[PDB]
Amino acid sequence: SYDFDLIIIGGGSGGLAAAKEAAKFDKKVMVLDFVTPTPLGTRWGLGGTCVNVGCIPKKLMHQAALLGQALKDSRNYGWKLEDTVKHDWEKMTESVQNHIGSLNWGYRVALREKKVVYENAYGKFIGPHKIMATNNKGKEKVYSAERFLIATGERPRYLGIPGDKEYCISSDDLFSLPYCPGKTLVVGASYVALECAGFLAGIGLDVTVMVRSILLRGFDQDMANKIGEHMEEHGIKFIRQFVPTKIEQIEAGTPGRLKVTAKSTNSEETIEDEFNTVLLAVGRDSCTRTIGLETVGVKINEKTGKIPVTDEEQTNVPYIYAIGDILEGKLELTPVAIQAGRLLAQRLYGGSTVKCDYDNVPTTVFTPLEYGCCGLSEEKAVEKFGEENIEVYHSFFWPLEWTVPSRDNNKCYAKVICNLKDNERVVGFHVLGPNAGEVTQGFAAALKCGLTKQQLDSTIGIHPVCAEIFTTLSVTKRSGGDILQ
Amino acid sequence: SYDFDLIIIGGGSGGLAAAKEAAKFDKKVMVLDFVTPTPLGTRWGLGGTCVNVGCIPKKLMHQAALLGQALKDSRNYGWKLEDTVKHDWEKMTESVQNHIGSLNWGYRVALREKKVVYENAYGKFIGPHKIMATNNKGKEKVYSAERFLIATGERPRYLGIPGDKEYCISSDDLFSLPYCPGKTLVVGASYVALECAGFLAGIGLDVTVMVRSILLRGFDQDMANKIGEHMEEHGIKFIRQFVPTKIEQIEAGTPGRLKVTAKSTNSEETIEDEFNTVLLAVGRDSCTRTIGLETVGVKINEKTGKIPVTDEEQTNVPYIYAIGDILEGKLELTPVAIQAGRLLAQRLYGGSTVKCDYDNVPTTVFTPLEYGCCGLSEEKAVEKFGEENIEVYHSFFWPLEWTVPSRDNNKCYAKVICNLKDNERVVGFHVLGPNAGEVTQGFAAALKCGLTKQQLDSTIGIHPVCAEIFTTLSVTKRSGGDIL
Ligand SMILES: Cc1cc2nc3c(=O)[nH]c(=O)nc-3n(C[C@H](O)[C@H](O)[C@H](O)COP(=O)(O)OP(=O)(O)OC[C@H]3O[C@@H](n4cnc5c(N)ncnc54)[C@H](O)[C@@H]3O)c2cc1C
Ligand SMILES: Cc1cc2nc3c(=O)[nH]c(=O)nc-3n(C[C@H](O)[C@H](O)[C@H](O)COP(=O)(O)OP(=O)(O)OC[C@H]3O[C@@H](n4cnc5c(N)ncnc54)[C@H](O)[C@@H]3O)c2cc1C
Ligand SMILES: O=S([O-])[O-]
Numbered sequence: 027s028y029d030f031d032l033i034i035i036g037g038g039s040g041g042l043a044a045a046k047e048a049a050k051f052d053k054k055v056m057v058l059d060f061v062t063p064t065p066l067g068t069r070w071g072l073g074g075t076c077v078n079v080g081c082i083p084k085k086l087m088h089q090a091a092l093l094g095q096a097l098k099d100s101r102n103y104g105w106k107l108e109d110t111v112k113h114d115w116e117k118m119t120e121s122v123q124n125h126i127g128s129l130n131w132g133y134r135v136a137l138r139e140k141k142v143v144y145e146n147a148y149g150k151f152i153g154p155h156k157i158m159a160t161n162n163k164g165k166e167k168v169y170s171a172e173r174f175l176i177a178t179g180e181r182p183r184y185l186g187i188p189g190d191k192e193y194c195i196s197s198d199d200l201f202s203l204p205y206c207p208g209k210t211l212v213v214g215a216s217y218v219a220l221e222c223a224g225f226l227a228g229i230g231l232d233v234t235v236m237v238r239s240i241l242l243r244g245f246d247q248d249m250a251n252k253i254g255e256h257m258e259e260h261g262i263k264f265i266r267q268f269v270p271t272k273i274e275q276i277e278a279g280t281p282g283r284l285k286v287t288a289k290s291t292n293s294e295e296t297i298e299d300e301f302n303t304v305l306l307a308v309g310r311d312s313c314t315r316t317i318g319l320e321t322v323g324v325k326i327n328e329k330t331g332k333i334p335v336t337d338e339e340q341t342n343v344p345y346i347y348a349i350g351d352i353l354e355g356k357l358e359l360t361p362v363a364i365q366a367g368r369l370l371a372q373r374l375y376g377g378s379t380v381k382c383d384y385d386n387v388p389t390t391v392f393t394p395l396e397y398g399c400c401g402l403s404e405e406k407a408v409e410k411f412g413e414e415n416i417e418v419y420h421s422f423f424w425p426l427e428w429t430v431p432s433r434d435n436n437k438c439y440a441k442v443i444c445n446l447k448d449n450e451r452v453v454g455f456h457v458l459g460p461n462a463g464e465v466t467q468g469f470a471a472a473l474k475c476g477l478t479k480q481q482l483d484s485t486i487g488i489h490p491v492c493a494e495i496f497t498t499l500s501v502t503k504r505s506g507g508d509i510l511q
Numbered sequence: 512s513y514d515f516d517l518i519i520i521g522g523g524s525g526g527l528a529a530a531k532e533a534a535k536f537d538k539k540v541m542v543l544d545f546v547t548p549t550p551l552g553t554r555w556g557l558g559g560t561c562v563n564v565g566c567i568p569k570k571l572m573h574q575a576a577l578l579g580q581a582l583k584d585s586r587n588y589g590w591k592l593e594d595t596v597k598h599d600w601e602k603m604t605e606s607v608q609n610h611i612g613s614l615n616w617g618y619r620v621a622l623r624e625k626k627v628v629y630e631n632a633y634g635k636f637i638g639p640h641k642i643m644a645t646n647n648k649g650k651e652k653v654y655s656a657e658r659f660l661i662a663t664g665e666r667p668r669y670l671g672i673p674g675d676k677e678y679c680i681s682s683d684d685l686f687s688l689p690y691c692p693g694k695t696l697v698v699g700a701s702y703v704a705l706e707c708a709g710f711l712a713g714i715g716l717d718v719t720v721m722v723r724s725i726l727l728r729g730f731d732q733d734m735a736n737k738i739g740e741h742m743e744e745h746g747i748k749f750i751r752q753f754v755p756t757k758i759e760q761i762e763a764g765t766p767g768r769l770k771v772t773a774k775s776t777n778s779e780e781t782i783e784d785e786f787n788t789v790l791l792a793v794g795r796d797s798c799t800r801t802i803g804l805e806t807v808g809v810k811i812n813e814k815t816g817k818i819p820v821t822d823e824e825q826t827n828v829p830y831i832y833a834i835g836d837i838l839e840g841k842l843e844l845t846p847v848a849i850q851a852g853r854l855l856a857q858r859l860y861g862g863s864t865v866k867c868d869y870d871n872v873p874t875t876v877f878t879p880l881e882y883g884c885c886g887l888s889e890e891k892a893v894e895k896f897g898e899e900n901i902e903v904y905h906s907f908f909w910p911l912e913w914t915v916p917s918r919d920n921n922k923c924y925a926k927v928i929c930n931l932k933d934n935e936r937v938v939g940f941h942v943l944g945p946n947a948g949e950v951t952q953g954f955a956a957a958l959k960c961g962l963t964k965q966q967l968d969s970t971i972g973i974h975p976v977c978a979e980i981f982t983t984l985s986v987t988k989r990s991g992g993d994i995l
């Protein structure tokens with residue numbers, strides 16, 4: 027018989043959630059987790075991308091930037107605070123790493139209490155029902171299991187140019203960087219790029235963002251553009267329609283000096299500039315190519331690296347499942363991986379028939395001005411239902427907290443997208459402003475219940491809170507009405 | 512015919528909202544607003560309780576307290592900030608009044624643009640379809656209208672004891688107080704009492720709360736008790752089951768020194784202590800007794816002062832309507848008054864048949880730890896549906912922002928209340944934590960759509976944000992499971 031009921035390959039958000047849930051049904055479970063180091067040698071503990079080099083440290087550094095702004099705001103509220111307050115990168119990073127270390131330990135303890143075997147080893151299939159585990163010393167051991175769950179996540183992509191691995195960093199290195207990045211170039215335009223750029227500027231750095239085409243491809247573009255305009259007003263420089271072709275080291279150091287050469291995407295024009303740090307945020311690649319899928323028959327999308335799965339998270343191979351960021355056509359989010367993992371365990375071992383619902387899943391981008399959304403972008407809604415059947419209600423708003431400091435009127439923005447063919451069903455929700463994620467969450471539940479504009483209008487606001495703007499939206503884009511407060 | 516289509520008595524949240532909406536239908540409208548001064552002389556501009564002496568300044572002073580805590584938190588996030596930061600009451604109050612002054616102006620401008628007549632005069636009915644308006648010099652003018660809207664709001668209550676009007680203040684005076692209150696006694700246990708106590712402590716004052724019976728009567732009591740415990744851990748002192756019997760002035764000043772004597776509610780025990788400022792937050796009374804209702808036949812509840820109305824906001828007198836805090840059995844909230852006013856204007860003049868919906872209206876209490884809720888308290892749900900038919904799911908949580916400063920784990924708290932006889936319909940929602948109102952608003956919209964537990968569980972969380980706790984609540988009170 028098999029060594030385990032279930033072996034899980036990857037101890038991140040999805041893998042750990044599935045492992046804890048499967049162990050409630052008295053199953054024998056092993057989790058394999060290993061962190062291959064970045065090209066410059068960075069590694070970390072158990073818990074995956076989110077805990078170590080993703081959501082958690084990112085939000086903490088965003089909070090540090092927010093706190094910088096709160097120091098300024100406090101003066102008009104009467105706090106007698108000295109004029110210049112400087113920021114200490116090492117102190118910040120030490121507190122972030124301390125918290126991450128406690129999570130690393132929490133997860134190890136938790137697996138032990140649930141009687142899940144944890145092996146700090148890299149897993150690679152070698153034949154049906156069999157996997158090889160290789161630890162940090164190169165010792166190999168072979169294990170078998172009745173079922174397997176692939177939850178290996180992704181890792182940052184490089185550009186394939188001279189000097190990129192040698193001199194640049196990615197998000198994987200940023201969050202434990204042992205020196206202040208200094209003058210920084212962020213290459214890319216994903217949410218990670220913009221978030222990182224945002225918090226680095228918010229702690230006082232000179233930041234530049236180099237963008238291949240557009241910001242936040244896949245997100246509502248009018249929202250994306252407002253985010254960018256706000257970043258630019260707060261001193262972040264944008265270089266539009268360029269990609270780096272090489273990175274050269276002018277001087278080593280911590281940080282050193284780097285010369286970046288870059289080429290226009292739509293012409294032959296070339297540019298050069300120098301930076302202390304270059305952060306590459308040009309996508310992520312799925313960890314699906316070096317895990318012996320070919321020895322067990324698992325098919326993947328050879329071009330993207332993603333794994334297609336059934337609506338129960340089964341690969342083409344019936345005893346092998348997959349969840350999380352490696353899935354094709356799903357979403358790269360922690361709570362999605364967590365829900366997929368828990369529900370999977372419940373279907374396999376608890377008799378449940380409930381499937382993970384990947385529709386209308388909310389997100390938030392933690393740019394200096396935060397952006398929460400759920401459902402369709404305006405352009406997707408127009409594509410799906412037709413322009414004549416879509417009504418968009420919108421407004422600017424001004425958080426009360428920002429009045430006394432006297433800043434940033436008419437930046438925060440709210441809209442809902444309604445389908446006129448279906449009782450003005452709210453098919454998209456978008457907010458730009460503080461605590462955007464806190465705002466969005468409950469409206470995402472309301473979308474699950476079929477919220478219509480009429481229901482939304484009958485809902486009473488809470489005063490004085492930003493979110494209440496959603497209960498009185500009466501001006502449509504189609505009307506051409508003015509929406510400046 | 513009449514001088515006006517509609518005369519509105521009271522230029523506060525409800526009255527202004529109704530006036531702006533009625534003017535969209537090309538009606539001739541007047542708003543009467545007058546602010547009778549507090550016993551110590553405080554007065555203010557157009558806009559009502561909320562703008563001048565309620566929601567707006569209260570949330571701004573709450574924000575000042577929050578910023579104090581942010582100063583502390585900033586150190587662990589790497590900001591090299593000096594050890595002691597002091598707070599300046601006058602600077603805070605000056606900025607708050609400056610903002611209120613821009614709102615006073617905004618509402619006058621907005622009436623004028625809508626062609627609504629604004630008269631700074633106190634209104635008192637004198638006969639059918641007729642009202643007398645008295646200005647600050649005592650000049651009287653008579654106006655008529657086809658319909659009237661009463662929206663006069665409420666004012667703070669005193670205790671009826673020696674020294675109370677002479678030496679104490681209320682919320683009406685607090686927000687423009689020209690000096691720092693110093694050592695403060697807050698008398699009462701309403702949301703106003705606790706919010707004011709909370710921000711005063713948050714800006715560094717020595718604060719004591721004197722409570723007659725319980726905290727936040729009318730609200731979920733387990734939530735109320737957690738709020739109080741949190742206040743107490745942060746240095747707010749509570750005096751339990753006492754009421755003041757007199758206030759005596761030891762020394763005049765700004766602030767002075769006051770001696771408060773108080774009596775136990777359930778014994779003969781007596782106590783004394785001294786304070787710089789005494790803030791009374793012991794309820795509010797409806798401005799319904801000095802407006803000539805008897806000359807037009809409008810019936811009120813003589814005991815409470817509140818006005819019963821139909822579901823269309825009509826009093827017993829068919830050309831006279833009422834909205835806002837004075838209504839019997841409704842809710843004392845700005846957005847409720849605003850909605851009621853707008854929808855009333857639309858029914859009277861726009862052919863709408865839509866009524867204000869007073870069910871599952873959310874609220875937030877802006878105590879140091881904020882409390883948002885919507886729907887039923889646990890004890891009201893149990894009364895209404897029966898204990899065996901109620902499931903409560905709950906959990907503590909720890910905002911990520913609080914980890915690095917390393918404080919206050921297992922304080923923030925979330926629960927939903929479900930009706931097992933109706934598909935686990937979520938009939939109550941409760942959250943204790945930061946940004947509680949931002950969290951509660953969308954869940955209130957979900958309650959309007961009939962949210963069930965299954966739908967809530969199928970909703971995916973946003974990570975890492977406090978509100979996501981609501982999407983994974985699996986532990987019930989009934990199960991006895993541990994939730995730390
Ligand atoms: C900068 C950044 C910010 C983000 N912010 C957010 C956010 O705000 N909110 C949000 O919801 N999501 C966010 N995400 C995404 C979130 O991190 C991922 O959605 C989530 O971690 C994916 O979980 P997972 O289980 O699929 O993979 P991971 O958590 O990446 O776990 C994969 C684990 O498997 C390990 N592994 C890989 N191959 C092997 C092998 N062969 N054997 C053993 N172990 C292996 C990996 O090292 C890792 O430990 C962010 C991501 C990044 C990079
Ligand atoms: C300290 C405090 C905090 C509060 N916080 C909140 C909160 O966070 N959120 C919230 O939603 N609500 C809050 N409220 C309540 C909110 O302020 C009221 O619900 C709301 O203002 C009621 O609006 P209204 O139109 O009923 O009356 P008001 O705005 O009180 O308006 C009544 C107006 O009529 C004037 N007036 C009275 N009699 C006459 C007369 N005879 N003739 C002419 N004018 C007259 C009054 O002076 C006043 O201008 C708070 C209240 C207080 C006291
Ligand atoms: O601005 S120079 O140090 O890269």
Ligand SMILES: O=S([O-])[O-]
Pocket residue numbers: 334335336341342
């Ligand atoms: O291979 S999955 O698309 O059935």
Ligand SMILES: O=S([O-])[O-]
Pocket residue numbers: 639805806807808
């Ligand atoms: O106003 S009643 O006396 O007709």
